[PDB]
RNA sequence: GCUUGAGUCUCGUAGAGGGGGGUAGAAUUCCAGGUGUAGCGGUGAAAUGCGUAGAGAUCUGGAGGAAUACCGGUGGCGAAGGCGGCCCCCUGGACGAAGACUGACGCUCAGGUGCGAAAGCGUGGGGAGCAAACAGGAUUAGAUACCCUGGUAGUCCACGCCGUAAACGAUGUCGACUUGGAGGUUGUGCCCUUGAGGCGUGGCUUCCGGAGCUAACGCGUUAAGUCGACCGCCUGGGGAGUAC
RNA sequence: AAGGAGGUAUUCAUGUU
């Protein structure tokens, strides 16, 4: 999973204080970092179907969070999917 | 998921009466309080109250007459999956008039008898016997 | 850095190389910013079952905090250094500095 | 089960010790279990059945102390 | 009654209680719900071949201890022994059988030595003080209660403990070897104990020499001794050095091979 | 029966302590059941791991007959 | 707007969860030797079979493949299929304590997508044991079987198919409510830990059971009581899960 | 193989063995 220090950096970048961990932006950013990390693992481990099920949950959760953000405040959504380098 | 808090309140009353509990409690809402007032004024429950500031809890003290529970049956009629509305002429008569149909008219929620006298239709929340 | 409990057992007739081996491995670990927390040369012990028809082999124990890469290299050294008969590296969650039951 | 003959111990006494030692290590039961292959489903079924009947007999006994037979 | 049994022990009570029997753990007692422990010299007072009076038949239960967690008492027939043993062991701790240069009345075989009581004291000793073979239990010279001979070495007479030695008499094999076996003589010996750093081969009665793992093979320095010679095998080794002071024989197998 | 690890506060059993582990193997060298020894299930699992690690390092024998 | 549903962060805990790579010991088989000699093996009883080119047995060394005794448990983990030596590397989920944060972000889901025992299929490996087909020997009125001696594909690996099972709890997922008891397992709080004690509070789990439900068997707070949301299916038996 | 006893089973010092 994601290290303690890596989570701390991301929370600082996307949250409006060190204690803002529940923001949609922070949640999407944490999910995106972990999703991007696991690509190397599943490049070497094409047969790890159990771990891949966990990864698909993460991808699915990021879509739900982005849908909420787009419907709730479109400007934050465009800014976020631009910083995080995500299509749609 | 909870998707019918009115049915949940009816269910708690039904289960509490069947289990001979003195009072039942549920999370509160203004629709629940309105239904509770109709029940109290028709004599199906003994009393109700609401306690709590941010997360109010509605408490109903149930009624038993000769050891037996007073509410013989209580069923949600209109439900999220199928809403029921009736015109003033088509209001139901629960138990040939010996029961009440809680009907949410435009002038508030009342019994079938009160709405029929006031010349209104509306949504039928529940049947109570 | 992770913690490692490394126990390797040497040929009884290479007993005099154990000091040297200890220093090399300690130097390798410590050069990679390592932290040797415990080091117990248990000495010549009677094997419970004959290994390669070799009773009475020389046990060494070493508890270490070091990067994974240096630990991998040390395990490879074991694989090739045909004086160490057996080795076992285990990952420990915390450092242990207390004397082992085999010390006394 | 490696029994060493003790001093003054007669052969019958030593032999009783050896037989009990083997029965304690369960050698003969192990060999009888490994004579033939049994499917994992058969093994699980047999294990579950023994547990069910053992539990039922314990409960039956623990209720038999309740009542008198005469 | 267990309270009263502990209180009667506080009185040094010598009661008529049912002994618990004879066992390798000494002697058991049984005082009305108190199973008593006592050692092999304190399990009964009768020094005979069947002490069932002390343990196994209603007999002396002595005041030796009261242990809640052990459910235990001093299960040994007191009020007989150690009583006159006061003056006897006074004369003993004054004499000790000529300062332990004396015989003793054996007790049993122990896991660390062989013990002969004195009657006011009680000594022990090693098993290899009257023999030299690789021993584990040396009791095969007498039964329990026989008369053995030892010389006193370390005796604590303020605790009633003794330790005599059995080598204060026997001619030293080492002295005859020093005149009989000069360095460089080859003789045959039987491997009594084998190690990875050396194998102990008994060449003569009571003489064990250490042949180093480096002296097992000149041309294959990495050969376990356990793979070349088995414990009990008879091998010819050349005496390289004799350390009489340390009672050590350095034996060389390397001289049979070629460097 | 009473577990001798819960009453001592032991966190990890340790495979380098060949005195406790010898009490928990039989003469043949197999691990004694927890039903006999009264050890708890959590410490039983730790204990079995420690015995297997000790066997690999030849601190304990796998069986009574290979030696 | 709000914080109670749903999520995030902080510290730990247990686990045959998954993938990759190493290694250990026992055993089976084969090979080469030494000792040794007339049987071995198999069965209800035999025979085929192996053995004087020296078997079986016993000891020593070697090769190789496959699986991990004991622990082991109506124990645990996983959505299911399923997962069992020990070590390392990569990785998924669950739970608990206290606190902070977001502020309904939820539930269900046709179509679709993915995973999915064993057998089987393709391509190449590997092959100790076991073993369809097959060969022989018996049994039998017959024996294309059960029994015996062998024995190929297959079982193992890598990469692709296949998509199915009594894939079963024969019990769709989510949520709420409704008397109890004895246990297991994994956390945590408190009290005198007086010494494995006492007292609480969470998760998962086995067995009894009350009201109520059940044609009945049963079920029962992990329902098959009482309710709500959404999806899947059923409409006599055979023909037939067949034809087109 | 047959019977008897104890339990759902052990705490029952270790040592000795
Ligand atoms: Mg997370
Ligand atoms: Mg579908
Ligand atoms: Mg297959
Ligand atoms: Mg194939
Ligand atoms: Mg092939
Ligand atoms: Mg066959
Ligand atoms: Mg099907
Ligand atoms: Mg299945
Ligand atoms: Mg099943
Ligand atoms: Mg079905
Ligand atoms: Mg039931
Ligand atoms: Mg078809």
Curated annotation (Swiss-Prot), chain A:
One of its GO terms (biological process) is cytoplasmic translation. GO terms for molecular function: rRNA binding; small ribosomal subunit rRNA binding; structural constituent of ribosome. SUPFAM superfamilies: S15/NS1 RNA-binding domain (SSF47060). Keywords: Ribonucleoprotein, Ribosomal protein, RNA-binding, rRNA-binding, Translation regulation. InterPro entries: Ribosomal_uS15, Ribosomal_uS15_bac-type, uS15_NS1_RNA-bd_sf. Induction: Part of the metY operon that extends to pnp, also has its own promoter. PROSITE patterns: RIBOSOMAL_S15 (PS00362). GO terms for cellular component: cytoplasm; cytosol; cytosolic small ribosomal subunit. One of the primary rRNA binding proteins, it binds directly to 16S rRNA where it helps nucleate assembly of the platform of the 30S subunit by binding and bridging several RNA helices of the 16S rRNA. Binds to its own mRNA, stabilizing it 5-UTR and preventing its translation. Part of the 30S ribosomal subunit. Forms a bridge to the 50S subunit in the 70S ribosome, contacting the 23S rRNA. PANTHER family: RIBOSOMAL PROTEIN S15, BACTERIAL AND ORGANELLAR, SMALL RIBOSOMAL SUBUNIT PROTEIN US15M. Belongs to the universal ribosomal protein uS15 family. NCBIfam families: S15_bact. This is Small ribosomal subunit protein uS15.
UniProtKB/Swiss-Prot annotation, chain B:
GO terms for cellular component: cytoplasm; cytosol; cytosolic small ribosomal subunit. One of its GO terms (molecular function) is rRNA binding. Keywords: Repressor, Ribonucleoprotein, Ribosomal protein, RNA-binding, rRNA-binding, Translation regulation. SUPFAM superfamilies: Ribosomal protein S8. Pfam families: Ribosomal_S8 (PF00410). GO terms for biological process: cytoplasmic translation; regulation of mRNA stability; regulation of translation; ribosomal small subunit assembly. Belongs to the universal ribosomal protein uS8 family. One of the primary rRNA binding proteins, it binds directly to 16S rRNA central domain where it helps coordinate assembly of the platform of the 30S subunit. Part of the 30S ribosomal subunit. Contacts proteins S5 and S12. This is Small ribosomal subunit protein uS8. It comes from Escherichia coli (strain K12). The lineage of its organism: Bacteria, Pseudomonadati, Pseudomonadota, Gammaproteobacteria, Enterobacterales.
UniProtKB/Swiss-Prot annotation, chain D:
Belongs to the bacterial ribosomal protein bS21 family. The keyword Ligase does not apply. GO terms for molecular function: rRNA binding; structural constituent of ribosome. GO terms for cellular component: cytoplasm; cytosol; cytosolic small ribosomal subunit. HAMAP family: Ribosomal_bS21. This is Small ribosomal subunit protein bS21. It comes from Escherichia coli (strain K12). Residues 59-70 have a biased composition (Basic and acidic residues).
Swiss-Prot record, chain E:
Disruption phenotype: Essential, it cannot be deleted. Upon depletion cell growth and total protein synthesis become linear. RNA binds at residues 46, 49. It comes from the Bacteria. It is found in: Cytoplasm. The modification N6-acetyllysine is found at residues 136, 186. Induction: Represses its own translation via the N-terminus (at protein level). Changing residue 46 to A/K: Loss of RNAylation by T4 ADP-ribosyltransferase ModB. Residues 12-78, 99-167, 184-254 form the S1 motif domain. Changing residue 126 to A: Decreased binding of Q beta-derived M-site RNA, 40% synthesis of (-) strand RNA, in construct expressing residues 1-273. Phosphorylated; probably on a serine. Required for translation of most natural mRNAs except for leaderless mRNA. Binds mRNA upstream of the Shine-Dalgarno (SD) sequence and helps it bind to the 30S ribosomal subunit; acts as an RNA chaperone to unfold structured mRNA on the ribosome but is not essential for mRNAs with strong SDs and little 5'-UTR structure, thus it may help fine-tune which mRNAs that are translated. Unwinds dsRNA by binding to transiently formed ssRNA regions; binds about 10 nucleotides. Has a preference for polypyrimidine tracts. Negatively autoregulates its own translation. Belongs to the bacterial ribosomal protein bS1 family. This is Small ribosomal subunit protein bS1. It comes from Escherichia coli (strain K12).
């Amino acid at each position: 999973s994601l290290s303690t220090e890596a989570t701390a950096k991301i929370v600082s970048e996307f949250g409006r204080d060190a204690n803002d961990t529940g923001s949609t932006e922070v949640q999407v950013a944490l999910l995106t970092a972990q999703i991007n990390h696991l690509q190397g693992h599943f490049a070497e481990h094409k047969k790890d179907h159990h771990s891949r099920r966990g990864l698909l949950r993460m991808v699915s959760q990021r879509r739900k969070l982005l849908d909420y953000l787009k419907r709730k405040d479109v400007a934050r959504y465009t800014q976020l999917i631009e910083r995080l380098g995500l299509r749609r | 998921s909870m998707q019918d808090p009115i049915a949940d309140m009816l269910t708690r009353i039904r289960n509490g009466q069947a289990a001979n509990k003195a009072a039942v409690t549920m999370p509160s809402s203004k629709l629940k309080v309105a239904i509770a007032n109709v029940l109290k004024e028709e004599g199906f429950i003994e009393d109700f109250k609401v306690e709590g500031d941010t997360k109010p809890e509605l408490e109903l003290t149930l009624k038993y007459f000769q050891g037996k529970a007073v509410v013989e049956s209580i069923q949600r009629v209109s439900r999220p999956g199928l809403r029921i509305y009736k015109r003033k002429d088509e209001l139901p008569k629960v138990m040939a008039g010996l029961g009440i149909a809680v009907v949410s008219t435009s002038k508030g929620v009342m019994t079938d008898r009160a709405a029929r006298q006031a010349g209104l239709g509306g949504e039928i929340i529940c049947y109570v016997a | 850095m992770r913690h490692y409990e490394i126990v390797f057992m040497v040929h009884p007739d290479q007993s005099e190389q154990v000091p040297g081996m200890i220093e090399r491995y300690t130097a390798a670990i410590t050069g990679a910013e390592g932290k040797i927390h415990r080091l117990e040369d248990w000495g010549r012990r009677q094997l419970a079952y004959p290994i390669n028809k070799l009773h009475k082999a020389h046990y060494v124990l070493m508890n270490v905090e070091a990067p994974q890469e240096v630990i991998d290299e040390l395990e490879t050294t074991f694989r090739f250094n045909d004086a160490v008969i057996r080795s076992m590296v285990m990952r420990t969650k915390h450092a242990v500095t207390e004397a082992s039951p085999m010390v006394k | 089960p490696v029994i060493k003959v003790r001093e003054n111990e007669p052969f019958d006494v030593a032999l009783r010790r050896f037989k009990r030692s083997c029965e304690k290590a369960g050698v003969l039961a192990e060999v009888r279990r490994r004579e033939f292959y049994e499917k994992p489903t058969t093994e699980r079924k047999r294990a579950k059945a023994s547990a069910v009947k053992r539990h039922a007999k314990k409960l039956a006994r623990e209720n038999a102390r309740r009542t008198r037979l005469y | 009654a267990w309270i009263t049994l502990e209180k009667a022990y506080e009185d040094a009570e010598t009661v008529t209680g049912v002994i618990n029997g004879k066992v390798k753990g000494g002697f058991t007692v049984e005082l009305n719900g108190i199973r008593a422990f006592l050692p092999g010299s304190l399990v009964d007072v009768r020094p005979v071949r069947d002490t069932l009076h002390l343990e196994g038949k209603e007999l002396e239960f002595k005041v030796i201890k009261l242990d809640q967690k052990r459910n235990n008492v001093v299960v040994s027939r007191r009020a007989v022994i150690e009583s006159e043993n006061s003056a006897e062991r006074d004369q003993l701790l004054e004499n000790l059988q000529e300062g332990m240069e004396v015989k003793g009345i054996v007790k049993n075989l122990t896991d660390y030595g062989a013990f002969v009581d004195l009657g006011g004291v009680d000594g022990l000793l090693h098993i290899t003080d009257m023999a030299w073979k690789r021993v584990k239990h040396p009791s095969e010279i007498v039964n329990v209660g026989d008369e053995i001979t030892v010389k006193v070495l370390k005796f604590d007479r303020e605790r009633t403990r003794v330790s005599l030695g059995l080598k204060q008499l026997g001619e030293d094999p080492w002295v005859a070897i020093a005149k009989r076996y000069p360095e460089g003589t080859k003789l045959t010996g039987r491997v009594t104990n084998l190690t990875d750093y050396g194998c102990f081969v008994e060449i003569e009665e009571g003489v064990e020499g250490l042949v180093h793992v480096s002296e097992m093979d000149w041309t294959n320095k990495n050969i376990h001794p356990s793979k070349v010679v088995n414990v009990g095998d008879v091998v010819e080794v050349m005496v390289l050095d004799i350390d009489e002071e340390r009672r050590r024989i350095s034996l060389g197998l390397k001289q049979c091979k070629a460097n | 029966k009473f577990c001798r690890f819960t009453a001592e506060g032991v966190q990890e059993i340790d495979y380098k302590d060949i005195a406790t582990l010898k009490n928990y193997i039989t003469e043949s060298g197999k691990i004694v059941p927890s039903r006999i020894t009264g050890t708890r299930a959590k410490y039983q699992r730790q204990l079995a791991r420690a015995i297997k690690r000790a066997r690999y390092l030849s601190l304990l024998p796998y069986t009574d007959r290979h030696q």
